[PDB]
Amino acid sequence: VVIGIVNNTVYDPLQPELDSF
Amino acid sequence: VVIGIVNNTVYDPLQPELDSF
Numbered sequence: 001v002v003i004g005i006v007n008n009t010v011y012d013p014l015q016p017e018l019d020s021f
Numbered sequence: 022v023v024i025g026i027v028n029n030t031v032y033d034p035l036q037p038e039l040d041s042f
């Protein structure tokens with residue numbers, strides 16, 4: 001529904017921590 | 022690079038929970 005959008009990967013800080021657990 | 026700085030243990034809220042898990 002948004003116009004002029006782009007694609008890029010946002011980083012979750014919890015994701016590397018929980019993956020390291 | 023900052024001036025007038027001090028040292029204190031800033032606290033992650035994830036760290037106790039993930040360490041308990």
Ligand SMILES: *[C@@H]1O[C@H](CO)[C@@H](O[C@@H]2O[C@H](CO)[C@@H](O)[C@H](O)[C@H]2NC(C)=O)[C@H](O)[C@H]1NC(C)=O
Binds near residue numbers: 006007
């Ligand atoms: C941004 O990401 C979306 C989601 O991956 C892309 O949409 C998909 O594009 C592929 C390739 O054309 C299609 O096979 C999928 O069916 C599309 N999905 C949807 C929900 O439309 C989109 O093309 C990407 N845009 C850019 C500019 O990279």
Ligand SMILES: *[C@@H]1O[C@H](CO)[C@@H](O[C@@H]2O[C@H](CO)[C@@H](O)[C@H](O)[C@H]2NC(C)=O)[C@H](O)[C@H]1NC(C)=O
Binds near residue numbers: 027028
């Ligand atoms: C604040 O903390 C930093 C990091 O531990 C201290 O810097 C270290 O101090 C020791 C002791 O003099 C040195 O052996 C290290 O080489 C220092 N490390 C760095 C990266 O500089 C700093 O002294 C502390 N400051 C105060 C006021 O407590």
Ligand SMILES: *[C@@H]1O[C@H](CO)[C@@H](O)[C@H](O)[C@H]1NC(C)=O
Binds near residue numbers: 003004005
């Ligand atoms: C910017 O304008 C061009 C046409 O010159 C168009 O193709 C493009 O989709 C526009 N992009 C945005 C973000 O408005």
Ligand SMILES: *[C@@H]1O[C@H](CO)[C@@H](O)[C@H](O)[C@H]1NC(C)=O
Binds near residue numbers: 025026
């Ligand atoms: C405050 O002033 C004193 C001199 O009166 C100086 O020695 C000290 O480093 C200064 N501290 C800060 C944080 O500016």
